[PDB]
Symmetry: C3
Subunit: 584 residues, 3 copies
Amino acid sequence: TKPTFYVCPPPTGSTIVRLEPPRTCPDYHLGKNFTEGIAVVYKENIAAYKFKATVYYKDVIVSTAGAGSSGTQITNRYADRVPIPVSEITDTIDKFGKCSSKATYVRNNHKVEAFNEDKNPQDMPLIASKYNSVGSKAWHTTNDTYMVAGTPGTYRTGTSVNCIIEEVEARSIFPYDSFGLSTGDIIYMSPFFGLRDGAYREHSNYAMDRFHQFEGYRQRDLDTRALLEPAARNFLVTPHLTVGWNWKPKRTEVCSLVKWREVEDVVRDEYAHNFRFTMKTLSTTFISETNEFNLNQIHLSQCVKEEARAIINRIYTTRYNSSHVRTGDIQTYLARGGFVVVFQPLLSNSNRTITTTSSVEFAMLQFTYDHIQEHVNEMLARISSSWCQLQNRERALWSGLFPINPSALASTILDQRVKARILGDVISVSNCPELGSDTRIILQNSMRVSGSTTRCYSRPLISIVSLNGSGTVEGQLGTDNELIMSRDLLEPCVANHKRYFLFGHHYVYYEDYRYVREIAVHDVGMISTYVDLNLTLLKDREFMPLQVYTRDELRDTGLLDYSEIQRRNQMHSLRFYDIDKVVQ
Amino acid sequence: TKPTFYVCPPPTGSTIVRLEPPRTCPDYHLGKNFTEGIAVVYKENIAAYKFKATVYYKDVIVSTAGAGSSGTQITNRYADRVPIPVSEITDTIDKFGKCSSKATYVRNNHKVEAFNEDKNPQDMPLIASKYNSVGSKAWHTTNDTYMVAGTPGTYRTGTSVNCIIEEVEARSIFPYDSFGLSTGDIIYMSPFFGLRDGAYREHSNYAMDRFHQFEGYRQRDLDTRALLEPAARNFLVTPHLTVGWNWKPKRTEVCSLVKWREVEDVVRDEYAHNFRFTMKTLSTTFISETNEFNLNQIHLSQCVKEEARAIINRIYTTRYNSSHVRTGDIQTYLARGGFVVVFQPLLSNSNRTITTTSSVEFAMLQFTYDHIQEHVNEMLARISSSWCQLQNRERALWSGLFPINPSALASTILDQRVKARILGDVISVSNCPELGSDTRIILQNSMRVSGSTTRCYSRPLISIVSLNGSGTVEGQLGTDNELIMSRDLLEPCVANHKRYFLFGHHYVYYEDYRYVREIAVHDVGMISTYVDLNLTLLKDREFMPLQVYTRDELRDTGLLDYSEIQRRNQMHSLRFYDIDKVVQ
Amino acid sequence: TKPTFYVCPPPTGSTIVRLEPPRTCPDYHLGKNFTEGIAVVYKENIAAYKFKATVYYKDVIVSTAGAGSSGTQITNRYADRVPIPVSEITDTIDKFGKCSSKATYVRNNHKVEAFNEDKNPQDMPLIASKYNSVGSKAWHTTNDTYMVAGTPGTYRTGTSVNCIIEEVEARSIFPYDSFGLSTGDIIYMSPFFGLRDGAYREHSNYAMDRFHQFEGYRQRDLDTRALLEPAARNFLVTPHLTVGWNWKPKRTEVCSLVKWREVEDVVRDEYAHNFRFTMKTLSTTFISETNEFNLNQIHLSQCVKEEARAIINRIYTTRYNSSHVRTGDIQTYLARGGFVVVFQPLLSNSNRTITTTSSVEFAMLQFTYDHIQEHVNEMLARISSSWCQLQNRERALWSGLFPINPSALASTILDQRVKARILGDVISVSNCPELGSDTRIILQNSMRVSGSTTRCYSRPLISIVSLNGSGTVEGQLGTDNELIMSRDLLEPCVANHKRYFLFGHHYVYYEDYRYVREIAVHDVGMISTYVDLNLTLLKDREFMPLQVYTRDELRDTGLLDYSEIQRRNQMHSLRFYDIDKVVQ
Ligand SMILES: *[C@@H]1O[C@H](CO)[C@@H](O[C@@H]2O[C@H](CO)[C@@H](O[C@@H]3O[C@H](CO[C@H]4O[C@H](CO[C@H]5O[C@H](CO)[C@@H](O)[C@H](O)[C@@H]5O)[C@@H](O)[C@H](O[C@H]5O[C@H](CO)[C@@H](O)[C@H](O)[C@@H]5O)[C@@H]4O)[C@@H](O)[C@H](O[C@H]4O[C@H](CO)[C@@H](O)[C@H](O)[C@@H]4O)[C@@H]3O)[C@H](O)[C@H]2NC(C)=O)[C@H](O)[C@H]1NC(C)=O
Ligand SMILES: *[C@@H]1O[C@H](CO)[C@@H](O[C@@H]2O[C@H](CO)[C@@H](O[C@@H]3O[C@H](CO[C@H]4O[C@H](CO[C@H]5O[C@H](CO)[C@@H](O)[C@H](O)[C@@H]5O)[C@@H](O)[C@H](O[C@H]5O[C@H](CO)[C@@H](O)[C@H](O)[C@@H]5O)[C@@H]4O)[C@@H](O)[C@H](O[C@H]4O[C@H](CO)[C@@H](O)[C@H](O)[C@@H]4O)[C@@H]3O)[C@H](O)[C@H]2NC(C)=O)[C@H](O)[C@H]1NC(C)=O
Ligand SMILES: *[C@@H]1O[C@H](CO)[C@@H](O[C@@H]2O[C@H](CO)[C@@H](O[C@@H]3O[C@H](CO[C@H]4O[C@H](CO[C@H]5O[C@H](CO)[C@@H](O)[C@H](O)[C@@H]5O)[C@@H](O)[C@H](O[C@H]5O[C@H](CO)[C@@H](O)[C@H](O)[C@@H]5O)[C@@H]4O)[C@@H](O)[C@H](O[C@H]4O[C@H](CO)[C@@H](O)[C@H](O)[C@@H]4O)[C@@H]3O)[C@H](O)[C@H]2NC(C)=O)[C@H](O)[C@H]1NC(C)=O
Ligand SMILES: *[C@@H]1O[C@H](CO)[C@@H](O)[C@H](O)[C@H]1NC(C)=O
Ligand SMILES: *[C@@H]1O[C@H](CO)[C@@H](O)[C@H](O)[C@H]1NC(C)=O
Ligand SMILES: *[C@@H]1O[C@H](CO)[C@@H](O)[C@H](O)[C@H]1NC(C)=O
């Protein structure tokens, strides 16, 4: 309980002030030039090129067995896969669905031969393998591996020739100098090698006499026994097999870029000296330079422009035909992360390769930040602008009310207890020091004027007693604990006089110009001019490196791992034999 | 320096206005119906099924050597892996820890045999390989590869049989029609094939006589020489090895879904016609349809419901037992990205497969945007609501103060210099045009009234001189550079008269009703009614496609790459020989 | 159209209130202690160690051919790769660029030999393979595979020995106990095995006599025929090849951590009991414990401290030399996600392994949330602070204007129609009930006072008629539809009297103290004290699990898949033969 009182000497012209004129209201130069449009986004093509081929070979197996007392012992099993010559394929397999039981091939630089069962050659019917199914089909001529034992003491040799044709899956990866077959065999020729249309400049590691190409060739369907439709067919004979595949030109088969997403609602704007492609349907934003990117700098990029045009046309005439018009030709941009943006601008009526990143998350982040930034910026700019207009409006209240109570308004603006006077169009102020220690303040009981019955004091009389005996002042209780050094606040005595005057931390209650009681300030109910506004803060948050699958998991999805099998199995000599022991 | 003055004709009833009544305060219908709960989130299981098996085989190696003058030359080395028959495994390996030095097998459709060292069969002790360690263990019967040279001019043949048993790791991937062994061998039978409990309908590519199953079988621990515990054991004999493994039913061994995260604090709400699962402990939000998802549409999904229940029970009775209650049975939902949400609703006291995406980042983005949106929306709604209440409160000030200075308040509201009068409950206004060119304004020195000593002008006298000679008006200086066309602002002459009046861009200072000096407006200190508010904007930001490991890096972690080894090594014939040369 | 009127009994002292004093303005204790700095961030090294090696072997191929009537048949082709002994490499290959046409090796625990063309040994020149190119180079001694047929009825055997040297790529993965060669061969020795500097404690599975190390060894460049520069060279002879490589110590060759990013602008602060490393140039934030992390707990982490120092020095003296100073030695922290932060604090003038996560997105999220949080928090705190100051300033208007119209101000604050009086420093209020049903209100035409010509009513006379006959009151029309129960609002009659008084939902127009017409409130133009503020909300947004490449795509980039090749090709016996058929 510490009551502070004030004393207010009259204002000399020592300190004159004026009310600050209205402020110029802020301007945030938001609003950007944009352009609506359609986009097709492309990514680096990382997928192998896939096609169908057929392998033609013979399993040749030569076995030497010795018969003994106990039984038969195999002394040698020489197994070899040999290519079926093109002549056999064209004149026997594809005409009759048969294959010779004699293998005719070269090995160790010699023309050599082998006869199934060591009998005279017959053209054997090609029969579907029992595991044939939709997917992988194959045909063969025997189920047997001919070998002959004979009578004890002797070594006999027998030959097995099994003529085999498999349909296989072929794969090739950029730059397409070779292809791999699902038998494990690698073919060191481009899948696009041929004799027409410059295709003879494709890569190959084989002498030309191993390669054959037949226009309008007709392959036999071994199951239906019928001829399939004519197509240019390649045959290449390698030392272990012949491969056959239907030739297609490279131009129509591979592309280094592939469609990632076609995008109907796109807005492009100039943003930090770049182009920004905001795609609200993907919650994704891509950023390129303002310069178009020339796709001709990229190997095999021909598919993109044409395919993009067709897509964009489909878009335009389906959802934009009435509403917008195209304002130029298509444009192409290289976005951050290695994405190719193919952009068609609209208007409403009113030699490298590209490496594409593995995640578009950064571009979703980019979108999410931009969206939030744009929205809170626009809202902050409105608050800011409205606040300014509000202060400027309210100045008129301050200015209009100032003559009614200059001291009270000035004291609030200056955050300081002052006395103020109006001097024409200007305010004159003076400081009201706090009443000091060693002073006592006595409240007088009567607000009546001595010797009058019609004239009263409008506020209580007080005497200010110096406790050290300097003197006593006869003043009155002003407002807000101000003490006035005179008694010139007077009024006509009213009937039914009831007043509460603030006195320190109490209200002091008078009736009929006489003191009645002291009341605690806290005993008087409050009403509030304060409009509540309760703003709280965004709290701290820690994001964890959440993963769906670890790197270990993602490498643990396959049947076998090559390196693991090799590590374990090349030990075999070391684990089960002594490689260091030498018999003398 | 350009001073503008105004002239204000009295308001006719031509333009009467009223003060806009209080506005209805905005309502943002925020607040959503939610439901607390517990969740277990599942993901597509991509991991191979892993189990232990044992392989039983014999290395058979037949060598033919010729002795010469110089030394010995190996002419042939025929090597073959042969299966150990089940009878040998059950009656010799598992009873005695021994294996016959004679291999008895079929090859080329013939029963054939081989004798270690070409001697009579003995049951050889199985001995641990020197590389045995925790991890991979194996046993064998010899360290030698028997071969015999003999005397020059002759060819001798010798046989090595080394009986080998390895513990191996087995792997199988969905749909579990086969399994791969760490020897590289593929077994074309389900690991779950057996004779009991429908297991005989599992896939197999082998004739039944190759398969054996023994209930309560007891395998011998070759190292401790003791019998291990009884279990149903499979044996399958293939042409190169016999495999043994302990059979377990499929139901208990594999599941197509696997636990990703159990989640204690979950809130579900209806959000854009969907269910939203906000998980503040993961900073992650998942979104499904409101319809439950029936797990029975998914192959091998039985593990999920039971495991989830047990987990959820653990959660409930450990941290929620006192505080909440379960308000139903468990529910299951399919969330965006291929996550299965198993959700238990709470209340406080008061045939396909599923493909799961590789990243949950989108769901963390989803969380982060939602959290930010919810918070700034709620705060914007409070600002907006408080602002409205504030304008409505302040209207009372405008209305109450209006009779004191109608012109000044109206001029600020209309942003236009007007003169206003109160006509009862209505405001009457008129426009105050700017004083034009070709006019000069002379300030009179004296504010005293001619012929009086008790009566004065309350503001300075001015004469308005038309510079073209139209006439002179005798008026006075009003407020804010208004010029009044009369001289009826009068007051009793006070003592100590000091006034500053605004006159163009100067204050004009009078004392005792006489002009004293001109003072520049900028020479008078300001006090401000403007409460400062300094809001700045979120700045532009560019996010880069940051990667930890590129695709190249992630494929560069293994010892060998299969395709690379093949590309390089199938060239071998081409690189070091001439395959095209034919000797005649 | 429902007009409500009020009646206001005079306020007794029953309800006295006071104006709430100014509120203490909120304090948000924002502002954090930070420290500027430089960082180098490290990640788990997952890349294989790569080096160059050379393999030395001989292809030995023994062929037996039988001549017949028809032609030649190959009966056996025994092929073997044999190691070239170190003596041959040091004394013949590296001195003369030649290799013996005789292979001398061990197999089946016997010293054995082979002669190219079965002729006497010659030292054959090593010749570059025709496929030699920048990348992979190799040399050999013959292009032929010698074999001999002879005359019919006979079997002849011939031997081919082709001496081969290839440059290969070598790979090793942690913990570096072995290495893989690009021929497919695994070498079961550390690439860092040697005889110096403790290197003899590295792993090896080979007897020591297979290993050789030569200090200052000089390898021959087979193409230039010149000796290369001296270096410590290892040779290891395995049963199929000899490997040669230039030895380097492990310390300088491998590290378990690798630089991810050097970072110039870094700010560290204490945040949720942790250290926060905000990196505005990466839009990425990392979080560690406040405790430094001791790198000595990690295998092979020596490269980090030294390399980091050098990098940081480069940074400091290039961009910070004048502006800041280093305030300590370098510090190292383990951040969430498995990143190692190497941090150098600045001041302006004024045994495990670490697993690093695959994505830094969470740390970009962390940055983006922090940045947004910091900015809207700081702005909310300013709004909140300015709002409070504004209410406190405006209280002075409420307080100063209160004596002019206590009822109107109190009615707005209390949101209730009250009558208020000032009783000294306190407000006395009373409720003004709505005028009830069954009452009719008649407006009197004349505001003139009967019997006077100089005295008038200041507002219209009204009579309040009880429709049930309780009586009539003669009062007047107060403000805002208040009805006053007396007629004591009087004024001197003015000239040109024109007033509009609100009466229900009409204004009622008087001239010269006489009624003239009724005017609809909506016919009187409004001016507004309401400053507009239009805030809208962030809208709902759904983020989709966007992927650039699916898991399928990322596994579809290679030429061949090992598991696929094996699955398909180990069927071969089953698909094209009958393995179950036994010939008797
Ligand atoms: C090497 O020897 C093998 C045998 O060891 C031999 O394999 C046969 O290969 C032929 C193709 O050349 C297969 O014929 C196909 O059979 C398909 C249906 O197979 C299922 O049903 C069989 C029921 O009997 C069929 O055949 C018999 C006569 O044998 C006949 O009476 C019936 O009407 C019926 O047609 C059944 O035997 C078979 O069982 C095998 O597969 C199961 C899989 O679970 C396995 O577990 C068994 O152990 C067994 O191996 C199976 O259940 C049939 O759909 C298919 O038809 C296609 O082609 C025809 C044209 O002919 C089209 O009309 C039709 O639309 C289809 O496209 C085809 O006919 C035959 O099944 C094999 N035999 C065996 C025992 O499996 C090889 O030919 C020999 N090779 C050489 C070089 O000689
Ligand atoms: C084919 O020939 C090979 C040899 O060329 C032969 O290999 C032996 O295989 C047996 C198992 O059959 C191995 O025995 C194991 O040895 C473990 C400890 O090995 C370390 O210590 C050895 C020290 O000598 C041991 O043995 C000698 C007698 O030889 C004895 O005096 C000692 O007390 C001691 O027991 C040491 O030789 C060995 O060195 C090899 O490995 C190092 C690795 O750095 C390599 O660099 C060397 O070049 C060398 O190859 C190594 O340092 C032992 O812990 C283990 O015990 C397990 O089983 C027993 C039961 O017997 C349990 O009681 C125990 O808890 C363990 O589970 C086991 O005894 C032996 O080491 C091999 N010998 C060699 C030279 O390595 C094969 O058996 C032959 N195979 C056939 C078919 O004949
Ligand atoms: C096994 O037999 C094969 C042949 O079947 C034989 O292969 C030769 O290997 C030698 C190296 O030992 C190769 O020599 C190299 O040739 C490089 C240029 O090759 C291109 O140009 C050739 C044009 O003729 C060259 O040689 C002739 C004489 O033959 C000469 O007149 C010319 O001036 C010219 O030098 C051309 O033959 C060759 O064609 C092959 O490759 C194409 C690729 O498209 C393929 O399609 C063909 O079918 C054919 O296989 C090719 O176009 C040359 O740059 C290189 O030079 C390097 O080394 C020298 C040092 O000698 C440096 O000075 C120089 O800076 C380079 O570093 C090198 O001279 C030769 O090309 C092979 N021959 C053939 C036919 O390809 C093996 O040697 C035999 N091995 C054994 C053990 O005997
Ligand atoms: C008492 O105090 C007053 C002011 O507080 C001072 O002016 C005066 O000198 C003091 N009187 C005595 C007697 O000390
Ligand atoms: C001078 O100007 C006044 C108004 O500015 C105009 O009314 C008057 O016609 C002018 N007088 C002459 C003589 O042109
Ligand atoms: C008429 O109404 C008044 C107040 O509305 C009530 O006091 C009075 O009793 C009523 N008079 C009659 C006759 O019912």
